[model samples]
Target: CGRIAQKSAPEDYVEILWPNARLVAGPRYNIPPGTRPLTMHRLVDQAEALARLPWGYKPHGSSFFMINAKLETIERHGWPWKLMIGTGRILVPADGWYEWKALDSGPKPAKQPYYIHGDAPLLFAGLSAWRRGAELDEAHGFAIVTNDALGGMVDVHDRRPVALPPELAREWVDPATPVARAKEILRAGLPETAFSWYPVRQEVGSSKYQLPD
Candidate 1:
């Protein structure tokens, strides 16, 4: 459910506690399968940095599509993630993402699109790295962290990416934190009442959509 279904303006991302809130253009449509550049907040050891890295994860592989990681399996199923969980934690800033619901009324099963975002800015949990490999030739990659859906997200997808609140952003990036505690933090979803969703123009499915909506 962490799919980047829509584009957002910096002002609309007020939920992101950081003082910077000037509207900036981000990937609005067709976030293709490849290493796309993005700005994310990260913590290396104890230091924090707003890094620019590719939006997918690839561990010594040539395939360029790796967008999201499951938070529930980060310890066991997520290879090399156990080490990066603490040291290379990050937060992906998103205005809102898109999802399509099946509706049978149309000639073709219509993908009813919706725009989802918190009342405040959202910081999506993620992991990042600076890797140099024969396939990528030296690129930085990242994967968004996801968990089982509970809120309105259940109506769209079975799983949803972990969206961190502003207050907890600093703690999530700390390298010394225990995994058990991190799991607990990740399990806690935003108050079911804080988010909102609505049907938006299906212009998102095309490549011509622009920002400042």
Candidate 2:
């Protein structure tokens, strides 16, 4: 099943190959209590590439994390996302991602570890924005889109990123396209053969262990 995977290659990984991928330099991500900024490639109007959008998002009123949004709701809702979805879409290139699952050991069950990856870099479909407040400086931010899992992903997690194929990527980012057409592409899953997953040491659970050794 599809589960969070690791990018064991400290230097070269999936994000490197994307034509639009950006390198985020500064802190080591594997360390605990550290904020490692990611350089995301924003497809602004299909002609411009933006930098430094925080990879997570939250609507104005929601307290829960909005790191991932369901594809089904993005189209139906008339929120700020409606306009963005109609014209702006982005790609989050990642080596891999992390997820947690519960076990039946006791009242407090531990989560089993799983590492999900593909032969190629992952292009996690997303939407983004630039926002500011008096207390906080302006920042570029984004959220990954999620959908029901297909392929081997069903066993590990009910949801998986809305991954795109290389051919459809450019079209998905086209700013002038109608929302209905874009939604069609998102409904179709990425080639199932393109992904794979396996178990890893649970030590990865700690954000402290994110640095390169």
Candidate 3:
């Protein structure tokens, strides 16, 4: 899984993504875990709420900061689906994500960084827990949902963040919807032909590294 995600679009564009998207700053080059980033999710009443959450999940089952969630076994994991079955589902917008590829034919297996993105904006499927009755800081924590990679992405990593198109965004959070339906949407992700990726400077591996627009 990647530790860096980048967004360079202005808030004006992202604000229009959801009916009431939580507005945020622009030009984030390196977003790592622990940052308070905006997340689009549903309220208990099913209304959309754009809010900020720590980019990691601290569940009742454990205290470690979890940055990614696997869809393959999330259902049977019991705790993940239990916490985010319906209303806690979320979407994270991004311009791209950073991943490192392991080089071949070397004893050290050197790694090179790459940037992965779609033609349009990306909204990563995620799960959130509005942690209550504990530290207020823990009130909101989330993890990016990941699934098997497709096409050439298999070279970068076997897993990639689960993303959805604008069409299925709303229905994804409907409490009445079946789990099988949600999984179906995830399995059939954005068009493979529309995705793009390229090699980037190795400096991207460090969270301290920043790029200019």
Candidate 4:
């Protein structure tokens, strides 16, 4: 998927993940890399908070930003991503996400955009360098944790965000959650059957274009 969508009211997300948290941003249908999107994470005092954070991470001294951290890299021995996997967890709430399927049947090949959705809002496991009230910058940006897209989802993309059901999502975002337990949640990510996708208008291919259809 190339982008994510937040279709429900901010308060709707609060009820699912954090009863006391209230996200202020409006619903965005197409969120690209580098933009701020809503995330649920623990504050410095360990209180649940819903806020927007930059969606990509630029490591210290790196020229490019990375929007995703692969599970393989996070689990590698002595890898820095392991540190975030332990304590920097967050939850990305989305109505669904967008993917493009290549249509090569004609002389002019085109991409057909597909909207993927679940029974309810999805909670994607995320990692952030940001702490409560940190400035928006490279050191404070966040990235979605992604794993191999198995089953039918591979038809949409080779990788998929680690979307966890509500119970495990709560565990992933807990500051006290151990690295081992966090990794287990990643392993138990929602299966492809948990979601469905439908082709949408090609207009969605443009990040600037926004419409519920």
Candidate 5:
């Protein structure tokens, strides 16, 4: 939930979703929280655009940053999240994400990293509150939306980001899309069967480790 892998070129994803959107950030093999990651969204009535946004949200009154938002909490129409799910919808494009699994062996169970991905680039459903010309702060950061992980994905983690296909992703960022309709789209996330994962070197545990391993 705290790490992602976006090794594909920006064109690979942007061309399919928003061909006219600008691309500022390039491929990054290992993207961790707090770093800026490429995102797609249309603010209010503005045209679609692509920009790098901090991967965590800092609420006005809290000192900590929130990297993940549970779908269950969003469904309840809670504060802060209500505006996010309504008009702050966004798409986080990535090749995949990393999940750590604990092994029962040894005194302290060793953790292994798994790379989960689909056939092509994945567009993870996200919520953000950012402005074009503003400083990068908690108010300008974003959070990836996550829900219960079903089937085999449960072995990796209890929760997984809600990733949608190209068409639905396009709709998710549309300002015209009703909030209720957006919730429905999120509920119909890509099935767990759409993804596959394999073990990779643990160097990815380090945020500074940017090699395409």
Candidate 6:
């Protein structure tokens, strides 16, 4: 899970994804589950917009949020593939994400944190859910998609947030794109070589610590 992530993307990246957006909510360095963050998406109406949604997808009547929906399962069925065919699709733009390496709880400080970044801002494929009722605020809900890590990224974790490039991302969120073609694009993910990562200070591994840079 790329649960811990930066709050904003580069200026150019934002301009491209959210060209018509009038406002944005971001720049927070710490993003835990349930925390509201800006998600770039196309509403069920097929209009592109920047929205504020909880990091996890919480189905009504359920207790926990689904942070990640596997691609294989989504490929077979569910709201993700279903929505991708319709208008309930989304792309979450992020600067980077975090993963912790379990060092067998031995001499290596138990676990080490790694920062996975990319040449460009990452647009994570996602599925968002919405509810309409007089009492509800209509805020959206979303969950990042994940695929088996390719290249050496698996050295850190076996799975990674499904990320996309500009062209593929646009097509992914575009309602005009057909389901079969869209699913095909997802099956052929962008190269993992474009992704880069490094270690950060141990402070971020804890909730009590906060810092920029």
Q: Best candidate, TM-score-wise?
A: 5
Q: Which one wins by TM-score: 2 or 4? A: 4
Give the runs in model 3 whose Cα sits over 4 Å from its true position.
4-6, 10-16, 19-24, 75-77, 104-109, 131-140, 149-158, 175-180, 206-213
The residue-by-residue lDDT of candidate 2 on 114-208, one tens digit each, is: 55667766666777654333122113345667774441252344467777775566566666667788788787657656767665664666221
Model 5, position 42, has a per-residue lDDT of 88
> What would the per-residue lDDT of candidate 4 be over residues 160-210, giving only the tens digit for each residue?
777888888888888788888888788788887888889876477622123
Better of 4 and 5 by TM-score: 5
What's the lDDT for residue 158 in model 1? 37
In angstroms, give how far residue 206 of model 4 lies from its true place.
Answer: 5.8
TM-scores vs. true structure, each candidate: 0.71, 0.69, 0.77, 0.86, 0.87, 0.78
Candidate 4: segments with Cα more than 4 A from true spot: 19-23, 77-80, 105-109, 149-157, 206-213
**In model 6, which runs have C-alpha deviations exceeding 4 angstroms?**
7-11, 18-26, 78-85, 105-109, 131-140, 149-158, 206-213
CA-lDDT, candidates in order: 0.58, 0.52, 0.64, 0.75, 0.78, 0.63
Top-scoring candidate (lDDT): 5
- Tens-digit lDDT string for candidate 5 (1-213): 677888888777788787565454557877887888988888746588777788889888888678887887788777677878877899999898877676565654666667889998899999987766767877778889888545225344436889887888999999899999888888778888898889877567522222335
List where candidate 2 sits over 4 angstroms from the true fold.
Answer: 1-46, 78-80, 105-107, 131-140, 149-158, 206-213
lDDT per residue as tens, model 6, 31-145: 7666666676666466666656666665555565577767776777665446534555677777877776665654534555677878766788877665223122223466777
User: In lDDT terms, how accurate is model 4?
Assistant: 0.75
Candidate 5 colliding pairs, count: 0
lDDT of 3 by residue, 61-162 (tens): 667677777776565546665557555677787777776677765555666667777776777787777633434354367778777544225353436777
The order by descending TM-score is 5, 4, 6, 3, 1, 2
Candidate 4: the clashing residue pairs are: none
Query: How far out, in Å, is residue 171 in model 5?
Result: 1.1
After aligning candidate 1 to the native by TM-score, how far in Å is the CA of 183 from where it should be? 2.3
lDDT ranking, high to low = 5, 4, 3, 6, 1, 2
* Candidate 1 accuracy as TM-score: 0.71
